Amino acid sequence: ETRELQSLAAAVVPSAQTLKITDFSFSDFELSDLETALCTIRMFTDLNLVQNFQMKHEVLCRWILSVKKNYRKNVAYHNWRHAFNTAQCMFAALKAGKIQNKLTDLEILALLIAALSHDLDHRGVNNSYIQRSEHSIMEHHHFDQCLMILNSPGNQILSGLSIEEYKTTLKIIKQAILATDLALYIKRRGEFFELIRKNQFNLEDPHQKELFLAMLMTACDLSAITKPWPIQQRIAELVATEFFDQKKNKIPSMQVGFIDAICLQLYEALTHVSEDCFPLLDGCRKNRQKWQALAEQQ
Ligand SMILES: CCCOc1ccc(S(=O)(=O)N2CCN(C)CC2)cc1-c1nc(CC)c(F)c(=O)[nH]1
Ligand SMILES: [Mg+2]
Ligand SMILES: [Mg+2]
Ligand SMILES: [Mg+2]
Ligand SMILES: [Zn+2]
């Protein structure tokens, strides 16, 4: 055991309300690593994951310290805090967004772990990992990393599932993590949008289900764009540091481009599926106003 394991194991886990992890506008800047650890335990607990799958407290905690340990602090945006936020947004979309009741326990378990794991050991967008010839290279690696951790002694938070469940869960986790390739998202979103405009959308279909989960993954991953302006500004600043340092005049422009190309349609779609995820669409719109205005002062 580490000092850090003992502390987190021995801690008390505040309520979801106390931790604020149910608000789409949640933010982590004032939180310590430990407090994120607790927030994470709180997420598994309130989603019924510890209950329904008999996770030993020490195992869960060890699993989380592991996940956290395998993000790089030296990377400005793509690090534990981003993974932590992705999962918190997943949580909020499940509870506040009233999406929990459209999905199976196993899907949820999988989405949460996927959310936490989907960028494991990421080195910043400007860094290269070589192998043979290239195919979501990165996301395949994040998944490997994820599985390694899941399979480590002391960290096996899935021990409590039958093989059948276990296999199912892994498949979902893997697909979730791979959905975080923006390339995959652009290939697949057309179909998602068609279904919506043609009133055809139906979650009871295996194929559409898997697609929604992919969409849901991307929505949480990009959710920083939906945050209150003072927070969105600060994240944009982290993203900028990773993009360029590892003028700032071109940035509000890129942000508007990013929102137009990628984010608005998605959060519109997600809002059709669930009217209670509107707060994300709303946030994203406000931020577009903010960035556009700036790009015009340029
Ligand atoms: C403000 C710094 C620049 O911000 C961006 C600039 C360009 C584009 S992009 O969509 O045109 N395209 C995406 C694929 N690669 C990255 C090539 C560029 C995205 C962002 C952007 N991305 C994310 C997701 C990581 C954010 F969370 C965020 O705030 N900003
Ligand atoms: Mg700290
Ligand atoms: Mg990514
Ligand atoms: Mg063991
Ligand atoms: Zn990500």
Task: Describe the 3D structure.
There is one protein chain. The protein has helices at residues 3-10, 16-19, 33-46, 49-53, 57-69, 80-94, 105-117, 137-150, 163-179, 182-197, 206-221, 229-245, 251-273, 278-297. With 298 residues, it is mainly alpha-helical. The chain has a single domain (1-298), classed as 3'5'-cyclic nucleotide phosphodiesterase, catalytic domain (Catalytic domain of cyclic nucleotide phosphodiesterase 4b2b, Orthogonal Bundle). Helix 7 crosses helix 9 (163-179). The structure holds the ligand CCCOc1ccc(S(=O)(=O)N2CCN(C)CC2)cc1-c1nc(CC)c(F)c(=O)[nH]1, magnesium ion (MG) (3 copies) and zinc ion. Residues 119, 180 line the site of one magnesium ion. It is classed as hydrolase/hydrolase inhibitor. Keywords: PDE5A inhibitor, HYDROLASE-HYDROLASE INHIBITOR complex. The assembly is monomeric.
List the topology elements.
Elements: H1 3-10, H2 16-19, H3 33-46, H4 49-53, H5 57-69, H6 80-94, H7 105-117, H8 137-150, H9 163-179, H10 182-197, H11 206-221, H12 229-245, H13 251-273, H14 278-297
CATH superfamily: 3'5'-cyclic nucleotide phosphodiesterase, catalytic domain
Number of domains: 1
Number of helices, counting only DSSP H or I runs of 4 residues or more: 14
Report the radius of gyration as a whole number of Å: 19 Å
Count of β-strands: 0
Content of β-strand: under 5%
Largest sheet, in brief, is:
none
CATH topology: Catalytic domain of cyclic nucleotide phosphodiesterase 4b2b
Report how far apart the termini are.
Answer: 54 Å
Instruction: Report the top-level CATH class.
Output: Mainly Alpha
The percent range for helix content is 55-70%
Organism: Homo sapiens
Protein name: cGMP-specific 3',5'-cyclic phosphodiesterase
Function: Plays a role in signal transduction by regulating the intracellular concentration of cyclic nucleotides. This phosphodiesterase catalyzes the specific hydrolysis of cGMP to 5'-GMP. Specifically regulates nitric-oxide-generated cGMP.
Family: Belongs to the cyclic nucleotide phosphodiesterase family.
